[PDB]
Ligand binder design. Structure first.
Ligand SMILES: Nc1ncnc2c1ncn2[C@@H]1O[C@H](COP(=O)(O)OP(=O)(O)NP(=O)(O)O)[C@@H](O)[C@H]1O
Ligand SMILES: [Mg+2]
Length: 297
């Protein structure tokens, strides 16, 4: 009952295996947004042993040299941690360039925060998300993957137990020669648009934007949020759907953490160890299981 035991070692899959598992990349199995119009596409799959997988399918042009693709995929595939949707393998046969990860069946932070079905996300879950993602980043950095290419709400996934995890796919670029941030520039770190180079300090700024998303319940430009915080207009910032779930004090403390993350100078931002340390004491409702908190099983 696969989510019981360890992920198992990184391996190379055949294209027949992956075609069989995804019903030949059936559009019905697309789990990413925008169907086949997106520059890459993620499919749900199921292996013959019933293990569920996520298959990221790239255009050959993104990763034309399979040797480079495999090398990168293998390095990411060494990482194994319960805060990650871990990378199980890759496939580079028949002109395909595929990454294979643990399937996370409860969608994304984007879905449950911005596009919720039952109920808005509970404060305690928002905090659990921030902790788990901080622990994921600390893990990744400890294993020599300190870059993460566009940390945002779509990278946060919910596992079989409805626990938040970080996508392994963002540990690699969307193409060999591409940009590390392909999303709206108003959300990117200030030095990024100067240099076009992702550093570990970039990821921390992006964690800050994740915090702002969690605080506000919407995808707020950081300059707008920072104006509100500067002017002490917190009631304009905070999600009105959180009313009565949090102290002014613990809300304050999370905004303080966001402010550090979002510092203009990269050397002033916290590191992942420090994010973990700041998030631990903020945790609430430890006794409520994630499936109950999220509103799933
Ligand atoms: N392990 C996973 N299990 C289930 N669904 C996943 C998994 N990984 C990614 N997804 C889904 O696929 C979406 C797209 O993932 P992905 O293509 O890796 O990133 P992206 O936000 O499109 N950025 P990019 O890396 O530029 O392609 C996520 O937002 C999830 O909806
Ligand atoms: Mg994509």
């Amino acid at each position: 009952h696969h989510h019981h035991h360890s992920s198992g070692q990184f391996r190379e899959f055949s294209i027949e295996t992956i075609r069989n598992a995804t019903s030949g990349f059936a559009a019905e199995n697309i789990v990413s947004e925008h169907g086949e119009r997106a520059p890459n596409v993620v499919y749900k799959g199921k292996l013959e042993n019933q293990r569920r997988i996520a298959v990221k399918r790239f255009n050959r042009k993104s990763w034309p040299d399979s040797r480079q693709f495999l090398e990168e995929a293998k390095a990411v595939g060494q990482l194994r941690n319960h805060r990650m949707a871990n990378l199980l393998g890759c496939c580079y046969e028949d002109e395909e360039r595929l990454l294979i990860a643990e399937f996370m069946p409860n969608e994304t932070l984007a879905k449950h925060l911005f596009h919720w079905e039952s109920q808005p996300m509970k404060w305690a879950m928002r905090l659990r998300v921030a902790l788990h993602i901080a622990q994921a980043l600390e893990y990744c950095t400890s294993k020599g993957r300190a870059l993460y290419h566009d940390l945002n709400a779509y990278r946060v996934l919910f596992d079989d137990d409805a626990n938040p995890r970080l996508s392994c796919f963002g540990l690699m670029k969307n193409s060999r020669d591409g940009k590390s941030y392909s999303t709206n520039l108003a959300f990117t770190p200030p030095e990024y648009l100067r240099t076009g180079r992702v550093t570990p300090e970039s990821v921390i700024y992006s964690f800050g934007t994740l915090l702002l998303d969690l605080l506000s319940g919407k995808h707020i430009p950081p300059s707008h949020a920072l104006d509100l915080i500067r002017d002490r207009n917190i009631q304009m910032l905070m999600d009105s759907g959180l009313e009565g779930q949090f102290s002014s004090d613990d809300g304050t403390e999370l905004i303080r953490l966001a402010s550090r993350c979002l510092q203009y100078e990269p050397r002033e931002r916290p590191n992942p160890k420090s994010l973990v340390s700041a998030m631990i004491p903020l945790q609430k409702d430890l006794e409520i299981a994630s499936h109950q908190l999220l509103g799933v099983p």
